[PDB]
Design a protein around this ligand. Structure first.
Ligand SMILES: [Mg+2]
Lengths: 98, 1340, 543, 44
RNA sequence: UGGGAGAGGUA
């Protein structure tokens, strides 16, 4: 729900227009522009920047119950960053193995 | 604030009041090596521990022994910088007093026979420098701490290795500190096994039979007994009621007259409560229940005398009948369930084929040493000396503590070897683990891993050398002479010195120090490498040890590790993490008391952290009151959850304790992704120090701690007033209260100027303090290589725009303006040492002279008459540095040739020239020439000039020392003269040097005057013999390698400007490579006119998720806005009061900031000096995880009269037009990494070739060719370029005839191909034929 | 090229044809490998032939049983111990007789394990008879010696020598063989001569394969020595390190940067690095043009770096393609040939389009430059491996020379449209007037405007018919219509162009026009993408 | 070991084989030379 | 000059 509300408020925020009426169009925001172009990144990366970080997993495979609620704009606290280091080091270790 | 803190105050945006100062960051290596050196005779540490664990040693008979008395470390011959120049180990000689006591065999105890003691010089252990480094063979090394598994006992289980069954196989293991291992385990058939030293398996009761146990004592130790009683042809069962839990009644358990259980019914918990409240004991039982149970003890008949039924046999109806007619009226029986009491020892006893103790020892012998014929005494000695010997098995502090904690004992000390009770308790705990009571241990828990630091590893290697020497001394004492044999003729100093030099020079952990900047030095000393001798590898390391365990919170950084194949093996130590007495890792914590967060601090290990509940550092406080919210966030038992504000028992000491040093120098760490923060913290250790270091505008406040405690600057030991500031030395006069009356009170801080480092960068110490300035204790006087006024300054902060620019910043690339190259911002110094050795050949010595044949003025225009390049002569590639020529004829002569030499003369005999030339591409001015020679070889004019300059400098230094010493003694004679009498004017109406002939009538103060005159004469005497010793040391030659006359060392100082190709990086993992230097007229300028210095790429923000670079950009824009306002106020020279008002307005801006600076204390000169230091920008301290917010950033931007969105309207400098969108402009702190394109670029046409395969060599240093690997051969096969593949495997490679004809054909214009068979295939044919297998090329 | 030979006193067994399972000696003699190892270790006697019925063939006796049989018979049976006994056993056996007996034995009953063991032995025996080898040849009597420039003796810089490990292993074999000859001449006791025969067997087996038989013989620095089997076999063996992938002359290496001013088939080599690469070619042109008499004069004229040398290098490097390799070369587009253009610097300026094929970003990468020498090799690099030829990926038939992230951002910002931006609702005479309007500044890139578009459709044959009408477009799409070649429809351009859309544009242009319009379309679309992404100013911020 | 016992031989028909030996591979440009060599061996 | 180990780093 948070990712859908974030994608709605980023895709169609440009509404201040003229010459017919107050009209609506796709937004000229640069983060949405470099996401919708297929240039660098995807909707998962935009969700981690603006919406919610999501549910991060333990190295034992099981998903932790409480998720990382803060994004990379409001800034994580200490315990959420220490939880995120699990998946970051796991992905970096997995990449070398493959 | 200090007086060097009031020069420039970094504004701190933090909100947490820090209660604990950041400790000394090099405390682990200093404390461990100080415990290794220093004499601790009770709590034995290091050398005293090794001496008392080896000595004393008797002979094989026992009539001769060496008693250890004491030891003392000698003084080092050379100092630290002298050892680094001369290229020798900085070590102190070890002298030990060892007493020889002879025992008499004629007397029963003939102790008083001969007492002989002396100082046996053995071993030269190296010493640590004051900043944590060793100097081994000239170079500078750092011995990395090791995270190995602690000694003790570790229960574990493979989670379903048997893919057919799926069962869990629990296994024990007893890991000692030194000795053979021991492993108990289960099989799929549920029998207990033993693998001593990871050998073949045995049944686990065979080691119990080796411990002198029968079946009786084994069953009585492990299992508990149920009793069966035979009375009047019925079976009476003794029954305690707590045994029918979870089992099914096989028969009707009844009473005397009461019915409890029925047939086919579970004896439930209500029936258990019924049994224990009626309290019946004797329960009858029919005969079919005995069939299935086993018997505890043996039963021999009193009449016959033979064993009716022995121990651990299957009881049945016929054996029950035999026992009842024999007359053993009490039957003892094991207890066996399927839930809580499993029959494991009984099944293992039925499998076990041994009989008794000697057969058990023979089978243990046949396992350990197979193929040997066993006997009784060898088996007894083997099983004793594997485990129960004080010399071949040892845990002795940490293994015994972990043993008694994992087995729930009480004493944290005891014996250092195993025991019968110890092995029995390990087997009992493993059986309880298999049953279900208890839980197995994890291996990556930091209560099981332990830091084995430098002093501990050096003590172990010293003990290995001591074991070799004590073996040799035992061999000498058991046979040789006893009376006239001094101990220093026996004890050889070779094995101890060889072992300790091998560890300190060529181990896997004593590695070359990466010291290209102070951050890399401090993060190489705070490093915990899990590899090494007795650790993991890169093959035996899966994702269990590499990944982050939740007990690393505070002890080990999760975001500082190499991103290659060492991704979890090389872990960096955190900031606040100390080290326990046993070696474990512990962190500070704020102990709370009834909700009040008390300032007292407890150090908690990794086992004690999992007990309590610990609050997160980001909880708010009511000015030393209680918590604010009711549901505070906390962590407990390794997981994070929520708790009430009264249940919490501990709080984190600071928000910086989770990270390392290099990961806490990054601003806005919480907004970055963890991968990019990892790469940024790894690249900050490779920043080359530039020409003029400049502070970061957006820092953390950790930079001051790193710059002080890195051991690279010159902090003031005692505060005072500086008396003489030079570019080479600082002379400071101490304050009066911090001065003892013994010394003069003048400190001379010499500064090392342009000393080569390990990574070929420069080390110079520019002073920052001015002449006549009061500095206190602990202020940075001389900025190091990359420091600015005591703050760490690894790079330069320049104006950065975030926009795509015409393709020149495509994928991470960086476009740099011409201002960065014109102002010489990123141009560093690369001092490179070239060395020319002069050998001693078999035809004559190699002379260094300017009489070089077959060379001209174009190469000898820079050499002098001695054959050595002038200091300051800019040389290029190919120019001769040191003129050296080897003789090709002969030099030695006979007296026949002596008389004929007087007749005729000499010859040339100097044909072969091997002069030292500059390698190609290297340039730069010579800055130092150091000519070491050997004692015996006569020097030359250049060598005498070097010794003359060194003698004059040393004479001036010691004359300054003599001057301050006579000044101190004159102050002392003035003090005792005023203490004796009242004499003020007559002392200074006469010159200060003529203060000795003054006197009065003879008294006790006259006697003090004469002995002070005697001290005056001996000060001059020790001065002149120190002068003689310094003169003798610089006159004599160094003892060089055998066959080496003299060694010349030339230092070239290249200056490396940036160019297209040079790597650059920020702090947030946004590395790049300079693709173009774009002119200042083409760079985009804003409305004011200032051109952008670096145009970045904005597409690295979403795909990498590093928002810290954009926040640092905005905060740097605000910082330089305030700095330009102060610079405009200083350029217009408005008012000191207006400057003070604006500076206080900019400092008192945050919402709830920690620091508070008031300028009412500040005078006029301090405010003017602060504005002068803030005219280049106002520095900002943004702490990790508690830094500045967007509200404070926008408030700072609205103060500095800037656009609050952070983006300005950049005009295109190339075409004049305006960009259609606002572009983010702001100052980013850019580094310059050590990957230079001058060192990366390489090419080869045709050079040297290998000798075995005759294909070209590999490497830029030896002019190598690029490898055309297996992947590229497949790519050419995929293309179908068969001709390109043939000419890249034959004529550009190992085929001499084909490549020579190819070279001649390319020179002669005709590009034709003359192929042939390569020579690696012929190497392959000859190697298979040398294996003995006929392989031939069958023609047609 | 010349080998020697060591004349071994006792003939020892080859460790390959004894320990590499299946053992081939246990599979030929039909004896267990443990019993054969007991015979070779001189622990137990074996009997070769016996006339009595008590002792048969291959009955492994102990020492006590042999001492019983020696005083019992002593004349009829002959039992030897060691590798010479196995040599005599392989000599006395008969290959065709055992093959015929096992062929009869296979026919009565067929248990699974017995039939598999019998057919393994029959295949082994039939391999010996059809190859013509003899079973006595597995026992090494004469050991050959590698040539002394293939086991070389290389020095160090301080006078001390650093030999190969093969010289150490050959010294061990020669010393123990000479000691065995001395012990056989000195009439040594049986225990001493048996231990020496066992030592020679251990030394020969260590030289053939160190880590195979037992404990590996370590050298002086506590590391196991490299034998012949360790020279050939492994990751650092002769095959995978020198035979498949060799080191290669005329080769360079440097960091790579971005050159967006290039074409699709060009790369920027530095001046000094290409002078070092093309040095014998410069020698040939110097001696051809008469500016150097001899090869030494030409060598020194290149080494002095004269202006005539730079002009000759500019003439030589013209139209002479070099291969840009980057490791790891996963797929076949990791090697491409480019016509080099000499630049001043130290970094190889690639084209931005080929860095999707190379999987290379400019964060410190490094690429190898190999130079084809012969005319056939230059024609492979010009017809097969030129960077304008391999546009489509060989994995799936889609173009890999594709705009990536910066051209894509620029083209998306071009062909997107706002609602009332600047100068909406005009009528234009065409694409040139639309470009004139934008660069004059009277209309933005996002004005919804009516332009006249003259698109060329394709006929049944190769002719091009045209149509001309008014289309409701933007100004950015009417700027790209100057770039899009003749042959494509307007529905190619008339949407917002993401990365998939530009991939479909290049695929459609390929399948319609060929290769040369596709190459010039990729270069022109990259130029306009870079230019309008620069004119955009698409910045990231915290708002 | 298997090749030495069975007495095998190599006919030199693989791309990896002609990389090791040092000839033109039968893949692309070398295919014409290899089929010419094959028909020369067949017709003689 | 060439060879072999050990440590670190870059893609
Ligand atoms: Mg890269």
């Amino acid at each position: 729900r948070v990712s859908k509300a974030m994608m709605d408020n980023l895709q169609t925020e440009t509404v201040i227009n003229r010459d017919g009426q107050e009209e609506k169009q796709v937004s000229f925001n640069s983060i949405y522009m470099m996401a919708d172009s297929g240039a660098r990144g995807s909707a998962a990366q935009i969700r981690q920047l603006a919406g919610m970080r999501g549910l991060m997993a333990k190295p034992d495979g099981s998903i932790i119950e409480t998720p990382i609620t803060a994004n990379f704009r409001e800034g994580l606290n200490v315990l959420q960053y220490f939880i995120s280091t699990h998946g970051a080091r796991k992905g970096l270790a997995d990449t070398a193995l493959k | 604030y200090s007086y060097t803190e009031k020069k420039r105050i970094r504004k701190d945006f933090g909100k947490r009041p820090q209660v604990l100062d950041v400790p000394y960051l090099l405390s682990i290596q200093l404390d461990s090596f100080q415990k290794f050196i220093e004499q601790d005779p009770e709590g034995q540490y290091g050398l005293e521990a090794a001496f008392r664990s080896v000595f004393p040693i008797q002979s094989y008979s026992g009539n001769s022994e060496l008693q250890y008395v004491s030891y003392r470390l000698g003084e080092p011959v050379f100092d630290v910088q002298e050892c680094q120049i001369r290229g020798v180990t900085y070590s102190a000689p070890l002298r030990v007093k060892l007493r020889l006591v002879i025992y008499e065999r004629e007397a029963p105890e003939g102790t008083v026979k001969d007492i002989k003691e002396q100082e046996v010089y053995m071993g030269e252990i190296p010493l640590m420098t004051d900043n944590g480094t060793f100097v081994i063979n000239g170079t500078e090394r750092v011995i990395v701490s090791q995270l190995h598994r602690s000694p003790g006992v570790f229960f574990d289980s493979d989670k379903g290795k048997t893919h057919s069954s799926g069962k869990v196989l629990y296994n024990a293991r007893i890991i000692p500190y030194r000795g053979s291992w021991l492993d108990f385990e289960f099989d799929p058939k549920d029998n207990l096994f033993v693998r001593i030293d990871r050998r073949r398996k045995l049944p686990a009761t065979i080691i119990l039979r080796a411990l002198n146990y029968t079946t009786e004592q084994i069953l009585d130790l492990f299992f508990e007994k149920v009793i069966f009683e035979i009375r009047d042809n019925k079976l009476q069962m003794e029954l305690v009621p707590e045994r029918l839990r979870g089992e099914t009644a096989s028969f009707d358990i009844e009473a005397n007259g009461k019915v409890y259980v029925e047939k086919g019914r579970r004896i439930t918990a209500r029936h258990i409560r019924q049994l224990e409240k009626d309290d019946v004991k004797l329960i009858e039982v029919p005969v079919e229940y005995i069939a299935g149970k086993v018997v505890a003890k043996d039963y021999i008949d009193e009449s016959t005398g033979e064993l009716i039924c022995a121990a651990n046999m299957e009881l049945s109806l016929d054996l029950l009948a035999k026992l009842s007619q024999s007359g053993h009226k009490r039957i003892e029986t094991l207890f066996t369930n399927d839930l809580d009491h499993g029959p494991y020892i009984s099944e293992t006893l039925r499998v076990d084929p041994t009989n008794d103790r000697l057969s058990a020892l023979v089978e243990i012998y046949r396992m350990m040493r197979p193929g040997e014929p066993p006997t009784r005494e060898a088996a007894e000695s083997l099983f004793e000396n594997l485990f129960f010997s004080e010399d071949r098995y040892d845990l002795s502090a940490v293994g015994r503590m972990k043993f008694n904690r994992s087995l729930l004992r009480e004493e944290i000390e005891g014996s250092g070897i195993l025991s019968k009770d110890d092995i029995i308790d390990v087997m009992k705990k493993l059986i309880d683990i298999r049953n279900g009571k208890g839980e197995v241990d994890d291996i990556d828990h930091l209560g099981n891993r332990r830091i084995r630091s430098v002093g501990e590893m050096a003590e172990n290697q010293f003990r290995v050398g001591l074991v070799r020497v004590e073996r040799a001394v035992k061999e000498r004492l058991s046979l040789g002479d006893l009376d006239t044999l001094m101990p220093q003729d026996m004890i050889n100093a070779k094995p101890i010195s060889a072992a300790v030099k091998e560890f300190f020079g060529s181990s896997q952990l004593s590695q070359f120090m990466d010291q290209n900047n102070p951050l890399s030095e401090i993060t190489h000393k705070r490093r915990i490498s899990a590899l090494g001798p007795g650790g993991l590898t890169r093959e035996r390391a899966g994702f269990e040890v590499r990944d982050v365990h939740p007990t690393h919170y505070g002890r080990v950084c999760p975001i500082e590790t190499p991103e290659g194949p060492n991704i979890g093996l090389i872990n960096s130590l955190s900031v606040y993490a100390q080290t326990n007495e046993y070696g474990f890792l512990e962190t500070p914590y704020r102990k709370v008391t009834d909700g009040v967060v008390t300032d007292e601090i407890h150090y908690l290990s990794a086992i004690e952290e999992g007990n309590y509940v610990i609050a997160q550092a980001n909880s708010n406080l009511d000015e030393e009151g209680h918590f604010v919210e009711d549901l505070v966030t906390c962590r407990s038992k390794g997981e994070s959850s929520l708790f009430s504000r009264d249940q919490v028992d501990y709080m984190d000491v600071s928000t910086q304790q989770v990270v390392s040093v290099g990961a806490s120098l990054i601003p806005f760490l919480e907004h970055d992704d963890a991968n990019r923060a990892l790469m940024g913290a790894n690249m900050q250790r490779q920043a080359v120090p530039t020409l003029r270091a400049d502070k970061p505008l957006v820092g953390t406040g950790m930079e001051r701690a790193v710059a002080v405690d890195s051991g690279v600057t010159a902090v003031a030991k005692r505060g005072g007033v500086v008396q003489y500031v030079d570019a080479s030395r600082i002379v400071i006069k101490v304050n009066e209260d911090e001065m003892y009356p013994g010394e003069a009170g003048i400190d001379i801080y010499n500064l090392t100027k342009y000393t080569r480092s390990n990574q070929n960068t420069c080390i110079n110490q520019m002073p920052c303090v001015s002449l006549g300035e009061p500095v206190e204790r602990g202020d940075v006087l001389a900025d190091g290589p990359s420091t600015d006024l005591g703050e760490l300054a690894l790079g330069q902060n320049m104006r950065v725009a975030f926009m795509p620019w015409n393709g020149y910043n495509f994928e991470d690339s960086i476009l740099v303006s011409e201002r960065v190259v014109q102002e010489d911002r990123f141009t560093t110094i690369h001092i490179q040492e070239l060395a020319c050795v002069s050998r001693d050949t078999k035809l004559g010595p190699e002379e260094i002279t300017a009489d070089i044949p077959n060379v001209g003025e174009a190469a000898l225009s820079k050499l002098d008459e001695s054959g050595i390049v002038y200091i300051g002569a800019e040389v290029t590639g190919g120019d001769i540095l040191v003129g050296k020529v080897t003789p090709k004829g002969e030099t030695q002569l006979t007296p026949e040739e002596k008389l004929l030499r007087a007749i005729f003369g000499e010859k040339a005999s100097d044909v072969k020239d091997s002069s030292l030339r500059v390698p190609n591409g290297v340039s730069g001015t010579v800055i130092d020439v150091q000519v070491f020679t050997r004692d015996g070889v006569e020097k030359d004019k250049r060598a005498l000039e070097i010794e003359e300059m060194q003698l004059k400098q040393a004479k001036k230094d010691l004359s300054e020392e003599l001057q301050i010493l006579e000044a101190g003694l004159f102050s002392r004679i003035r003090a005792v003269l005023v203490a004796g009498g009242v004499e003020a004017e007559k002392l200074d109406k006469l010159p200060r040097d003529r203060w000795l002939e003054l006197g009065l009538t003879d008294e006790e103060k006259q006697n003090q005057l004469e002995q002070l005159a005697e001290q005056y004469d001996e000060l001059k005497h020790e001065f002149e013999k120190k002068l003689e010793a310094k003169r003798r040391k610089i006159t004599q030659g160094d003892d060089l390698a055998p066959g080496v006359l003299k060694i010349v060392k030339v230092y070239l100082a290249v200056k490396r400007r940036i160019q297209p190709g040079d790597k650059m990086a920020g702090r947030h993992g946004n590395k790049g490579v300079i693709s173009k230097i774009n002119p200042i007229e083409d760079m985009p300028y804003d409305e004011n006119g200032t051109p952008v210095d670096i145009v970045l790429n904005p597409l690295g923000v979403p795909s990498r998720m590093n928002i810290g670079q954009i926040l640092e950009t905005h905060l740097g824009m605000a910082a330089k806005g305030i700095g330009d306002k102060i610079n405009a106020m200083l350029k217009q020279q408005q008012e000191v009061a207006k400057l003070r008002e604006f500076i206080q307005r900019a400092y008192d801006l945050g919402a709830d900031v920690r620091q508070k600076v008031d300028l009412s204390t500040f005078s006029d000169e301090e405010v003017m000096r602060l504005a002068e230091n803030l005219r280049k920008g106002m520095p900002i301290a943004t702490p990790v995880f508690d830094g500045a917010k967007e509200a404070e950033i926008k408030e700072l931007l609205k103060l500095g009269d800037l656009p609050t969105s952070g983006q300005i309207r950049l005009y295109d400098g190339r075409t004049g037009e305006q960009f259609e969108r606002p572009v983010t402009v702001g100052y980013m702190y850019m580094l310059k990494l050590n990957h230079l394109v001058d060192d990366k670029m390489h090419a080869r046409s045709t050079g040297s070739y290998s000798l075995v395969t005759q294909q070209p060599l590999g490497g830029k240093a030896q002019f190598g060719g690029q490898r055309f690997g297996e992947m590229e051969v497949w790519a050419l096969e995929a293309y179908g370029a068969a001709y390109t593949l043939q000419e890249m495997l034959t004529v550009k490679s190992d085929d001499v005839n084909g490549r020579t004809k190819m070279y001649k054909n390319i020179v002669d214009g005709n590009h034709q191909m003359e192929p042939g068979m390569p020579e690696s295939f012929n190497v392959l044919l000859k190697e298979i034929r040398s294996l003995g297998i006929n392989i031939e090329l069958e023609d047609e | 090229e010349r080998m020697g030979h060591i004349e071994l006193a006792s003939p020892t067994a080859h460790i390959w044809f004894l320990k590499s399972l299946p053992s081939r000696i246990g599979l030929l003699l039909d004896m267990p490998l443990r019993d054969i190892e007991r015979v070779l270790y001189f622990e137990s006697y074996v009997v070769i032939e016996g006339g009595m019925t008590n002792l048969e063939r291959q009955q492994i006796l102990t020492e006590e049983q042999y001492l019983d049989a020696l005083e019992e018979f002593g004349d009829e049976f002959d039992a030897k111990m060691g590798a010479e006994a196995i040599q005599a056993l392989l000599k006395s056996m008969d290959l065709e007789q055992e093959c015929e007996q096992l062929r009869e034995e296979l026919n009565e009953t067929n248990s699974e394990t017995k039939r598999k063991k019998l057919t393994k032995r029959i295949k082994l025996l039939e391999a010996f008879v059809q190859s013509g080898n003899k079973p006595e040849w597995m026992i090494l009597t004469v050991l050959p010696v590698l040539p002394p420039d293939l086991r070389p003796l290389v020095p160090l810089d301080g006078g001390r020598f650093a030999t190969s490990d093969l010289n150490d292993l050959y010294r061990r074999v020669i010393n123990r063989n000479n000691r065995l000859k001395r012990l056989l001449d000195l009439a040594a006791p049986d225990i001493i001569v048996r231990n020496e025969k066992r030592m020679l067997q251990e030394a020969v087996d260590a030289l053939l394969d160190n880590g195979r038989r037992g404990r590996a013989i370590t050298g002086s620095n506590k590391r196991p020595l490299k034998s012949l089997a360790d020279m050939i076999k492994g990751k650092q063996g002769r095959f995978r390190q020198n035979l498949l992938g060799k080191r290669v002359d005329y080769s360079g290496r440097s960091v790579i940067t971005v050159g967006p001013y290039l074409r699709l088939h060009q790369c920027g080599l530095p001046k000094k690095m290409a002078l070092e690469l093309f040095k014998p070619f410069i020698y040939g042109k110097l001696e051809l043009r008469g500016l150097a008499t001899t090869i030494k004069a030409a060598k020194k004229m290149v080494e002095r770096e004269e202006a005539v040398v730079w002009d000759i290098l500019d003439e030589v490097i013209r139209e002479h393609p070099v291969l840009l390799n980057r490791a790891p070369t996963l797929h076949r587009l990791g090697i491409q040939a480019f016509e080099p253009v000499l630049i001043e610097g130290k970094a190889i300026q690639l084209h931005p389009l080929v860095c999707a094929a190379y999987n290379a970003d400019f964060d410190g990468d490094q690429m190898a430059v190999h130079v084809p020498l012969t005319l056939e090799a230059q024609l492979e690099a010009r017809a097969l491996m030129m960077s304008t030829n391999n546009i489509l990926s060989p994995a799936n038939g889609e173009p890999i020379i594709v705009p990536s992230q910066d051209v894509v951002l620029g083209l998306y910002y071009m062909t997107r449209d706002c609602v009332n931006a600047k100068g909406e609702g005009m009528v234009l005479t065409g694409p040139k007037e639309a470009e004139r309007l934008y660069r004059s500044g009277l209309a933005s890139l996002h004005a919804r405007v009516k332009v006249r578009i003259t698109e060329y459709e394709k006929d049944a044959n190769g002719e091009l018919v045209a149509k001309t009408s008014l289309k409701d477009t933007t100004v950015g799409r009417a700027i790209l219509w100057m770039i899009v070649p003749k042959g494509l429809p307007y529905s190619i351009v008339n949407q917002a162009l993401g990365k998939k859309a530009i991939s479909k544009m290049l695929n459609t242009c390929y399948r319609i026009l060929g290769l040369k319009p596709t190459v010039i379309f990729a270069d022109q679309i990259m130029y306009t993408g870079f230019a309008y992404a620069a004119r955009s100013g698409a910045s990231v911020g915290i708002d | 070991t298997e090749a030495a016992v069975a007495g095998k031989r190599d006919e030199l028909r693989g791309l990896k084989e002609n990389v090791i030996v040092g000839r033109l591979i039968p893949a692309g440009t070398g295919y014409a030379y290899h089929q010419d060599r094959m028909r020369r061996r067949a017709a003689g």
